[PDB]
C-alpha cells in the first residue's frame, strides 16, 4: 500500500534465471532404477506369450476383498497359538483322554509344491494364485493345471498381500481344501464369479497374446500420418 511495488520476472529466453522447476523426467537416475524401469516398459513393447499373459488380468478390488475376507478367518496357525494348543492338548489328556477331539481342523494350505499336490488329487476347492512372481516358471503351469483337474483358480494382485495371510513375506499360492459349514455357501458364492472369468474362458485366455503396444511418443506420430491421410480423402 505505501510503496510495496510489484516486480515480476520475465522467464523467457534471454531474461532472468529460470526458476527451479520439476525436472523429474530429465534426471540421471542410477542404473538400478533405469534397469528397473526399462524392463517394465519392455514387457509392454514385446509380444508377450499368452501363458505369461494369463496374468495381468486379475480380480478387481471388490472381488479380491470378498476373497481375502474369507481367507482371513481361515488363517494358518501362528507359533503363538501353536504353543498353547499343545498346552491345551496335554491338559485334556490329563483330563479326559479322548480318542478324537477335532474331526478336521480347517485351514488353507499355502505353497506351490503343497498346492500342486492338492490340485492334481482334486482335493482343493479354490486356488488363489499370485501375480508378480519373480521367475514366472515357478507358477506358469498352474493355471493350465487347474483347468484340467477341474479346480477353479483366480489371480490376485500382489504376492505379498496374500503372504500376509500366512504370517510370512510372500507365499505365491493359497488354496482352500476344507471350509466350515457356515461358510460353505460363502466359498461357493465367489466360486462362480471366478470360474466364469478364468476356467470357462480358458480358450480365450490361451489365444490372448499380450504386450506389442508402442510407446506414447511413437504412437503419437503414427497417428499424425493417419490424420493427414484422413485429411487427404476430404
Amino acid at each position: 500500500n505505501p510503496l510495496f511495488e510489484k516486480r515480476p520476472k520475465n522467464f523467457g529466453i534471454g531474461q532472468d534465471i529460470q526458476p527451479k522447476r520439476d525436472l523429474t523426467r530429465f534426471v540421471k537416475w542410477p542404473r538400478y532404477i533405469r534397469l528397473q524401469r526399462q524392463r517394465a516398459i519392455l514387457y509392454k513393447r514385446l509380444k508377450v506369450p499368452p501363458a505369461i499373459n494369463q496374468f495381468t488380468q486379475a480380480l478387481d478390488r471388490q472381488t479380491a476383498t470378498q476373497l481375502l475376507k474369507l481367507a482371513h478367518k481361515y488363517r494358518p496357525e501362528t507359533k503363538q497359538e501353536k504353543k498353547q494348543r499343545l498346552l491345551a492338548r496335554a491338559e485334556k489328556k490329563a483330563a479326559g483322554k479322548g480318542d478324537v477331539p477335532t474331526k478336521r481342523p480347517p485351514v488353507l494350505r499355502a505353497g506351490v509344491n503343497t498346492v500342486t499336490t492338492l490340485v492334481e488329487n482334486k482335493k482343493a476347492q479354490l486356488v488363489v494364485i499370485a501375480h508378480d512372481v519373480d521367475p514366472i516358471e515357478l507358477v506358469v503351469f498352474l493355471p493350465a493345471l487347474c483347468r484340467k483337474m477341474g479346480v477353479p483358480y483366480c489371480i490376485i494382485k500382489g504376492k505379498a498381500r496374500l503372504g500376509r495371510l500366512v504370517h510370512r513375506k510372500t507365499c505365491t499360492t493359497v488354496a482352500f481344501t476344507q471350509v466350515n459349514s457356515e461358510d460353505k455357501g460363502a466359498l461357493a458364492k465367489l466360486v462362480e464369479a471366478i470360474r466364469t472369468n478364468y476356467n470357462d474362458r480358458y480358450d480365450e485366455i490361451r489365444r490372448h497374446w499380450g504386450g506389442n503396444v508402442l510407446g506414447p511418443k511413437s504412437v503419437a506420430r503414427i497417428a499424425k500420418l493417419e490424420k493427414a491421410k484422413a485429411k487427404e480423402l476430404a
Binding site: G12, I13, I17, Q18
Partner: protein
C-alpha cells in the same frame, strides 16, 4: 625383421602430440533450450593463439540460463570478428558474421565454418585456417541438407546441425615459404615428433621395404594395395592413378 617408422607412430611414446601450451578444445557450446528455440547473447573477450594450430581462437563469455554464473566458451575464430563484439547463438539468431545458427534455417549458398557432421557434436567439419563450407539444397521434408566440404566433396548431413557463419581466420598462411630448415623445426616442435622425414630408400632392408641395394632405387612398384599389412603399406597407398596430374580430378 625390424619394425618400420610409421608402425612406431601408433604406440604413441614420443609420437604423441605436444599439447601443453594449447588452450582447450575449440568447440561450439552444447545445444539446449536456448538454441533449439531462440537465441542467446555472448560477448567475445579476447582473440588468442593456439600453438600448433594455424587458426586463432575466440573466448566468449555467455550468461548461464539456469545458474547465476558467467561461463566461458572457446570458439574457432571466424574471420572479421573483434573483441567486445556481441555474438548471437540460436535457431532464431540473425545471420551475421560470427553468429552460429542451424544450417536448416540459413539460406542456400551461405558460407559456413566449423559445422557439425551429426547434431550436437559441437563442431567437427571445416575448421582449418582459411577454410569454409557452402550449403545448398535444403530438403524440408525428411530434413537433410547437403553441404560442400573444403575438399570439394559434397555431403548430405542433418538439418539441425549447427554452424558459425563466416570463414576461419588466419587464411592465406600456406602462401608464404617456410624458406629455411629452421622455421620448419619450430613449426613441428609445436605439433608432433614428425618433422625430419628420412626417405625409406635411404635406409636399410630391416628398416623399410624400399631400402637396400648398391644404388638408391625403389626396385619394386611403389603403388601398393589397400589390404597390404602393416609394415608394407609404404608409398602410394591404393593409388587410383600416378604421374603428374592432368585435368582437375575427374573421379567422384
Amino acid at each position: 625383421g625390424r619394425v618400420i617408422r610409421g608402425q612406431r607412430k601408433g604406440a604413441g611414446s614420443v609420437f604423441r602430440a605436444h599439447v601443453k601450451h594449447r588452450k582447450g578444445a575449440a568447440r561450439l557450446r552444447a545445444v539446449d533450450f536456448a538454441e533449439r528455440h531462440g537465441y542467446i547473447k555472448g560477448i567475445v573477450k579476447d582473440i588468442i593463439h593456439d600453438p600448433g594450430r594455424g587458426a586463432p581462437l575466440a573466448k566468449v563469455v555467455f550468461r548461464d540460463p539456469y545458474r547465476f554464473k558467467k561461463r566461458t566458451e572457446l570458439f574457432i575464430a571466424a574471420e572479421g570478428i573483434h573483441t567486445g563484439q556481441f555474438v548471437y547463438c540460436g535457431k532464431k539468431a540473425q545471420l551475421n558474421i560470427g553468429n552460429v545458427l542451424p544450417v536448416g534455417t540459413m539460406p542456400e549458398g551461405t558460407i559456413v565454418c566449423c559445422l557439425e557432421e551429426k547434431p550436437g557434436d559441437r563442431g567437427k567439419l571445416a575448421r582449418a585456417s582459411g577454410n569454409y563450407a557452402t550449403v545448398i539444397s535444403h530438403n524440408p521434408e525428411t530434413k537433410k541438407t547437403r553441404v560442400k566440404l573444403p575438399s570439394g566433396s559434397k555431403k548430405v548431413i542433418s538439418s539441425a546441425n549447427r554452424a558459425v557463419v563466416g570463414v576461419v581466420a588466419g587464411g592465406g598462411r600456406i602462401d608464404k615459404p617456410i624458406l629455411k630448415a629452421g622455421r620448419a623445426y619450430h613449426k613441428y616442435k609445436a605439433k608432433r615428433n614428425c618433422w625430419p622425414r628420412v626417405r625409406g630408400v635411404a635406409m636399410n632392408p630391416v628398416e623399410h621395404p624400399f631400402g637396400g641395394g648398391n644404388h638408391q632405387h625403389i626396385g619394386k612398384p611403389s603403388t601398393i594395395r589397400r589390404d597390404a599389412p602393416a609394415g608394407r603399406k609404404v608409398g602410394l597407398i591404393a593409388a587410383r592413378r600416378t604421374g603428374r596430374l592432368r585435368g582437375t580430378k575427374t573421379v567422384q
